[PDB]
Design an enzyme around this catalytic site. Structure first.
Site: not given
Length: 330
Positions: A35, A199
């Site tokens: 994770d 992004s």
């Protein structure tokens, strides 16, 4: 040193991925959920409330000759999906894909919430976010990667998640045969303890690319792709019959649909998520309403590039003094 381990979807939807981890002496192999969105390595154990164990493999520290109680240390964690676990701490030898860390904090669960109990395939989590999020008290502990870093050939690990298929976690090297083209690296903020990046935009299917900054985290421990409501609305508007359902808890779509791809930007580069990756199947057995793999982050407080996004790429988690993230097509 290096390590290399195969990671395997737990079910036919890729709801999560498990990776075998050796703990203790002799080895006890547990299948952990790696994770990159948390920083605790915790396991079902011989200490776990018996009624909260249902099929998991447990770590038994008393059977490990290298286990030592970390005296006074406790841990307690709550995840974004509302699940939780807590317990005490041992140090022991932990190996992943041939890479061995001695003195790793192994957090032994005394309690786990229902969603963990109900998932017999996940024996614990291995956190790979930054150690500043580790919940051990009163002495915070380091992640497996943090402990291994100085020994690694290169201070990196890579995630290569499969679509309905096994993939790979590598530690300490970049497998140049595992991706196509070049890797595009992008800046990381560690201020929140996550692999947080920005992004450069998105496209829906064959549509034009929208340049826009989307701050989010690279999180292997989250199943879906969570993005701003504007972006998510633009995506699902291209699917006839798709709608946001409060009763179901997100966007659903007719199972008869063909989903468009979703592209996200990494600097000047582009990663394409095929439409099939965004299908998470009937909302309930036999239903013709299917659950979407792109959902709104509104009310999460952060955008999350979970497995839906990451499994479309080869992802480099660069743990150099100034960390960065790399993405390549594959």
């Amino acid at each position: 040193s290096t390590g290399s381990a195969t990671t395997t979807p737990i079910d036919s939807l890729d709801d999560a991925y498990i990776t075998p981890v050796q703990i203790g002496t002799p080895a006890q192999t547990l299948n952990l959920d790696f994770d990159t969105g948390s920083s605790d390595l915790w396991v079902f154990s011989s200490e776990t409330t018996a009624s909260e164990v249902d099929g998991q493999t447990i770590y038994t520290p008393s059977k490990s000759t290298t286990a030592k109680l970390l005296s006074g240390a406790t841990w307690s964690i709550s995840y974004g999906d509302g699940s939780s676990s807590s317990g005490d701490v041992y140090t022991d030898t932990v190996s992943v894909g041939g890479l061995t860390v001695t003195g790793q904090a192994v957090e032994s669960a005394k309690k786990v919430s229902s969603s963990f109990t109900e998932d017999s395939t996940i024996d614990g989590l291995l956190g790979l976010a930054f150690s500043t999020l580790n919940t051990v008290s009163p002495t915070q502990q380091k992640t497996f990667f943090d402990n291994a870093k100085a020994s690694l050939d290169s201070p990196v690990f890579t995630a290569d998640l499969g679509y309905h298929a096994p993939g790979t976690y590598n530690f300490g090297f970049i497998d140049t045969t595992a991706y196509t083209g070049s890797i595009t690296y992008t800046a990381v903020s560690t201020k929140q303890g996550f692999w947080e990046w920005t992004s450069t935009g998105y496209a829906v299917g064959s549509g034009t690319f929208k340049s826009t900054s989307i701050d989010g985290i690279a999180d292997t421990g989250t199943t879906l792709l969570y993005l701003p409501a504007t972006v998510v609305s633009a995506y699902w508007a291209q699917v006839s019959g798709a709608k946001s359902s409060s009763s179901v808890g997100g966007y659903v779509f007719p199972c008869s649909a063909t989903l468009p791809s979703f592209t996200f930007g990494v600097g000047s580069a582009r990663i394409v998520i095929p439409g099939d990756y965004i299908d998470f199947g009937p909302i309930s057995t036999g239903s013709s309403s299917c659950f979407g793999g792109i959902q709104s982050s509104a009310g999460i407080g952060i955008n999350i590039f979970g497995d839906v996004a990451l499994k479309a790429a080869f992802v480099v988690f660069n743990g150099a003094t100034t960390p960065t993230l790399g993405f390549a097509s594959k």
